[PDB]
């Protein structure tokens, strides 16, 4: 079907405004809906997943006003859990980051609810959440397949006390439990068996909760101590941070071909995991300046690195194409996570990199990249993966054009990517 050809960019320079991150947009919405008072949410993500969260909240009785074409939401807080007089079916599409938090809040609410989504969501397991909610006394039933949505929920006053949980495999469910637990009538102790995956995901959640006046004690991710009978308090203004993974492409472009780029939407107080990406560009020679709500990169000659990037696997992909512009052989280590996605991103990146003329070595969990003297013109297969398209856009910072197949695979996660890139291309 479609291809996009990007022609050689002589220089990158300018400002990029990142839209709100998906998962923080959902957390901001749910928290503001539960809070006491009026919150103005700014930089809210405009997308189909957020629109389902907005619709679910409207169904549940929450009053808000949208403005600036959906990027600003003034929410009148409900001051606690929801109350629906009639059975509601809430359809959350493919909104994974809304699904678990809402399931938790609805389990604590008064009403009867059916929670469902697209066939893609129905293949995402929910058993850990459901088991943790059952330890809080929740009443939830699988309507189709055991451990999968869709679910029927009869809301109850949940009782906290001791919740014992396994944090290897998934941490998404913990986030949902952390959000509701302060609002219960009892105190809650959450105990984690294993080593907990996705720590930054927990950090973001506890960070936004703290901004809405709710504290939880985190004991090194092995236990969480929660005081009950807390209440979220509305913020005058809350700006949804942009996605740090999305920042990576523009920071890399600025390091390679700048000029100066300032990415707005992510700043110095962010606790997103992929904020660590900037450190890799610094080790490569780029100059980085963190500011209150933005980060600035200034272009410098880059040198290859050999580093573990286990902590930032999405943004690490950006490093694989940035390596095409660095002196020496770049090695990205400890990225087995790339292999367990829909498509094996390790082999996919390697295959496309060889097409532009790089020498690439693939191991179980590393990739090693040696740039050619001159890049070759290629038609890049994107494997339905937004990240592959966005990484290989950086090839246009060479003397050679790049053709990207199926560029609309960006449409659901970052539709304006290519337009934003053109805004900073001179």
From Swiss-Prot:
One Pfam family named in its UniProt record: EPSP_synthase
Biological process according to GO: amino acid biosynthetic process; aromatic amino acid family biosynthetic process; chorismate biosynthetic process
Pathway of action: Metabolic intermediate biosynthesis; chorismate biosynthesis; chorismate from D-erythrose 4-phosphate and phosphoenolpyruvate: step 6/7
Source taxon at top rank: Bacteria
Active site, renumbered: 314 (proton acceptor)
Principal EC category: transferase
Keyword RNA-binding tagged: no
EC id: 2.5.1.19
A single GO cellular-component term on record: cytoplasm
MF (Gene Ontology): 3-phosphoshikimate 1-carboxyvinyltransferase activity
Reactions catalysed: 3-phosphoshikimate + phosphoenolpyruvate = 5-O-(1-carboxyvinyl)-3-phosphoshikimate + phosphate
Binding annotation for phosphoenolpyruvate: 22, 96, 124, 172, 345, 387, 412
Protein's job: Catalyzes the transfer of the enolpyruvyl moiety of phosphoenolpyruvate (PEP) to the 5-hydroxyl of shikimate-3-phosphate (S3P) to produce enolpyruvyl shikimate-3-phosphate and inorganic phosphate.
Subunit structure: Monomer.
Protein known as: 3-phosphoshikimate 1-carboxyvinyltransferase
Gene that encodes the chain: aroA
């Amino acid at each position: 079907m479609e291809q996009l050809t990007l022609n050689p960019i002589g220089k990158i320079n300018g400002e990029i405004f990142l839209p709100g991150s998906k998962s923080l947009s959902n957390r901001a919405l749910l928290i503001a809906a539960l809070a006491n008072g009026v919150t103005k949410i700014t930089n809210l993500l405009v997308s189909d997943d957020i629109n389902h969260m907005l619709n679910a909240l409207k169904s549940l009785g929450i009053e808000y006003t949208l403005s600036d074409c959906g990027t600003e939401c003034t929410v009148i807080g409900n001051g606690g859990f929801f109350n629906a007089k009639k059975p509601l079916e809430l359809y959350l599409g493919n909104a994974g980051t809304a699904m678990r938090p809402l399931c938790a809040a609805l389990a604590a609410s008064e009403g009867e609810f059916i929670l469902t989504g697209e066939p893609r969501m129905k293949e995402r397991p929910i058993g850990h959440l459901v088991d943790a909610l059952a330890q809080l006394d929740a009443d939830i039933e699988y309507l189709e397949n055991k451990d999968y949505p869709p679910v029927k929920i009869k809301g109850k006053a949940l009782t906290g006390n001791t919740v014992t949980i396994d944090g290897s495999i998934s941490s998404q469910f913990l986030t949902a439990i952390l959000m509701i637990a302060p609002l219960l009538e009892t105190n809650t102790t959450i105990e984690i068996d294993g080593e907990l995956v996705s720590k930054p995901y927990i950090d973001i959640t506890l960070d936004i909760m703290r901004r809405f006046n709710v504290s939880v004690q985190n004991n090194d991710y092995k236990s969480f101590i929660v005081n009950g009978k807390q209440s979220y308090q509305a913020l005058d203004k809350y700006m949804v941070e942009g996605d740090a993974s999305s920042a990576s492409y523009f920071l890399a472009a600025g390091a390679i071909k700048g000029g100066e780029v300032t990415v707005h939407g992510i700043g110095k107080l962010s606790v997103q995991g992929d904020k660590h990406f900037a450190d890799v560009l610094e080790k490569m020679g780029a100059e980085i300046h963190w500011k209150d709500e933005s980060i600035t990169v200034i272009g410098k000659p880059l040198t290859a690195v050999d580093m573990d990037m286990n902590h930032i696997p999405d943004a690490a992909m950006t490093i694989a194409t940035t390596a095409l512009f660095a002196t020496g052989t770049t090695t990205i280590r400890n990225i087995y996570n790339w292999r367990v996605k829909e498509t094996d991103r390790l082999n996919a990146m390697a295959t496309e990199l060889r097409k532009v003329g790089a020498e690439v070595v693939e191991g179980k969990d590393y990739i090693s990249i040696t740039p050619p003297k001159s890049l070759k013109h290629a038609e890049i297969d994107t494997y339905n993966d937004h990240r592959v398209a966005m990484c290989f856009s950086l090839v246009a910072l060479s003397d050679t054009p790049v053709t990207i197949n199926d560029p609309k695979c960006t449409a659901k996660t970052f539709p304006d990517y290519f337009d934003k890139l053109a805004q900073v291309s001179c």
